[PDB]
Amino acid sequence: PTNFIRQIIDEDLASGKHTTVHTRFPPEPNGYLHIGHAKSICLNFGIAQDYKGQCNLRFDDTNPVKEDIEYVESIKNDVEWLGFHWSGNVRYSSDYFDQLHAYAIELINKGLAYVDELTPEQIREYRGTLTQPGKNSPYRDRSVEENLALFEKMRAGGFEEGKACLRAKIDMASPFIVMRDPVLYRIKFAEHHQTGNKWCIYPMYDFTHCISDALEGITHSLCTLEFQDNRRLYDWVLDNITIPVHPRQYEFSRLNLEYTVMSKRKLNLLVTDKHVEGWDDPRMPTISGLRRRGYTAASIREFCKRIGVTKQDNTIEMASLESCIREDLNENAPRAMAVIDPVKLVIENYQGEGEMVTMPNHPNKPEMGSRQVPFSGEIWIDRADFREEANKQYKRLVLGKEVRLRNAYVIKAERVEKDAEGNITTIFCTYDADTLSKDPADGRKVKGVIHWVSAAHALPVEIRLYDRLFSVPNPGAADDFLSVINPESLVIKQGFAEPSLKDAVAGKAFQFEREGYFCLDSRHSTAEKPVFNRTVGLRDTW
């Protein structure tokens, strides 16, 4: 799976520009990782592995105010869970604060940096617009000594937040807004989750990222399109300080998934306002949320591989994601029996207490073994598999027809029983004792096959059916994305599953025949009532 980035790397390896590739994944610890990040992780860690190079995990923790240790830990966890390993120790842009400061000093001594005393509002007014150039600050001409003293004051804590900031001296008229004297350092009297309260001044993204890449020996710095203008500043910094290497930035388009939001801020809102059960809610586009949903790390890598890596904006369809998980779970998850919409179905013909049938763990894979499941005379069936009257297009059970029970005998409906509101309560039938292995005795073709759960064992399992979190394709575009949340993103149903499912361990995928793929939801599951999340439904369509 090639892309414009790998081609660039090949070209560098060839020309001799580089003799090894070194990339990095730099997530800000201000929320959990989502499927979007996974794309960046696969692209960065994948390239490293594929070229026998190294990929660093660096927390771009330059803004203490929006960061928390909770995220650092969950991000490490999700990167590991995806199957990747970073080179060396976990890095932190904060590991370079002393270095950044030293570089800020080098810029000041060369007259490429100064301390601006213009207020946060005045800097915006002096910035210009998209069509009008900005104007130089009245402080832009201080002398080296003065800037030197003033920056020390900033660091010493002599200025209140916003009262001062260090800016790079570039061009207030540049058509690139980012080059209009970008702020290098800003004052914040906040506690840092790594440096505590040692610093009252913190470096900005643009000043920090390139120096961090540089110090780490990064060869190809890979980010998203919204940073293309920034590259000019990225290069400006490396070109004006004393540093032996000059990593190059290459940008690719970010991933967008229909019916969901990818923005950290918006995912945080859903969590803060409790519209989901925390970052790892099974309806969330987060790595951990997909994990709880039943997605496999392997399926996510397949997805990231299929969507590609380009510069064209894009919004992948849910079907593309779902296709990947069905593919991984189809040949791996062992089949089981469960009924989500239960209805009593007593077969008068049958006598006794029951027996045991041999059910395969995978109809096309014998190597997966088989198991023993109870067969009583009061089995459970799904409402959707029985109908008093139905055309030749209905393959299930008719009021006077005979359907075939999965890995059992050909049942045959005869009578029905309803309640005081027309709803059926029990379905009485009969069976052919000479079925089991195969053949309908005489030869009468049996149309269709349905799943069931003998009421003998029958484990009362709770089932969670999830659906799109938003009722519109691009919820982000809405005026208020929250107002377009799908009220039925979650529907809880009570059903019955074969007894063997009590051994189900959270993290193990199961394919409930004729229904979909499920897995135990540790968070809700109890010693009494085990809960199963429906990862994805089976391909449904008559």
Add this chain to the structure above:
RNA sequence: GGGGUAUCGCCAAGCGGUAAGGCACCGGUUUUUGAUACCGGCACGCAGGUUCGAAUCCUGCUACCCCAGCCA
């Protein structure tokens, strides 16, 4: 004003000489899961122009995304 993007419904390969593939959808075969597997169906923003030859080069144009945080 600057930076970018435009190839089948959604992705994507293609880098001047026959428009890959995946997803979705539509058929058919096999199937004791309406599942799977298998087979088949599914084409270059517009306008000019250079070239024997253009999705690939040039001119003009249109559509859309990003940039006016002391966020990243």
